[PDB]
Design a protein around this ligand. Structure first.
Ligand code: HEC
Ligand code: HEC
Lengths: 129, 129
């Protein structure tokens, strides 16, 4: 295994998701007008989200559904669909990174919403209530 | 500020460092023979370390030296030198990513050691004992 104990795998994936959320939420705040929009900071965030999105799958090792985690056990009996949702997150984050190189606000919002749908769609099925 | 409270900034930088350490340590384990060396996994790790190294500086916001943190207060009275160490970490991680595209083991070890010196050199000065 890549981790000494199961708790290390849980902490790893949780930390990657938390960092993803900070960067993704800053993009959302800018698009929603909650803070000033800045195209360079937006692109920096999109790069961070794309890089961070490659990290958490590693942490979903067998046997790491016990203890202090919000990951449902059915992740590991439906692992093919789970992995496919994670892969789609990657593609969507790559599209948002590409969109961040342009200044078309509607295309930015559209690409952002596709990533957001990836986050929520996986959570609704595979994260504890 | 990019963070709602100081504890959020602390958690952010701590999480980025923790993820960096997992990826960096896997490269070290492979170079030291503690686990089988794999050039593709090594390159994946080098990319992750380079991406993650761009994240933690954001978290060192003014006033976030109180509470549950190992960051010393002198980070903020010596912030120029601190930032310069972080920038050098970036350059070193970029060099290790470039080295990971080749199969020269001595050059890989040399580039890895330069990053490791960045980690320890900053810790020795700016992280609590
Ligand atoms: C499945 C394919 C997921 C996708 C895509 C995204 N997330 Fe998620 N997330 C998932 C799980 C199974 C869990 C629980 C992990 C655990 O071990 O507890 C999470 C958790 C989070 C969290 C909380 C992290 C923590 O501090 O404990 C956050 C903030 C989070 N996820 C955010 C997030 C965002 C912003 C996403 C899209 C950009 C996203 N996740 C995708 C499963 C999946
Ligand atoms: C200064 C310029 C640093 C460089 C370069 C690196 N690190 Fe570091 N690290 C630094 C500080 C000030 C702190 C304390 C942060 C806090 O708020 O507590 C840390 C902390 C860590 C940790 C512990 C994280 C945690 O879970 O709390 C780790 C595992 C860590 N740092 C690893 C690490 C590695 C592997 C580095 C090089 C690749 C590296 N850091 C560079 C300051 C600095």
């Amino acid at each position: 295994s890549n981790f000494k104990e199961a708790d290390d795998a849980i902490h790893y994936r949780q930390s990657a998701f938390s960092l993803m959320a900070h960067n993704f939420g800053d993009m959302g705040a800018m698009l929603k007008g909650k803070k000033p929009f800045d195209s360079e900071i937006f692109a920096m965030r999109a790069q961070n989200v794309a890089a961070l999105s490659k990290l958490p799958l590693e942490g979903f090792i067998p046997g790491s559904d016990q203890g202090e985690t919000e990951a449902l056990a059915k992740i590991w009996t439906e692992k093919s669909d789970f992995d496919a949702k994670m892969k789609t997150l990657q593609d969507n984050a790559a599209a948002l990174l590409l969109a961040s190189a342009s200044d078309d606000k509607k295309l930015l919002k559209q690409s952002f919403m596709q990533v957001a749908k990836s986050c929520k769609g996986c959570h609704d099925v595979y994260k504890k209530d």
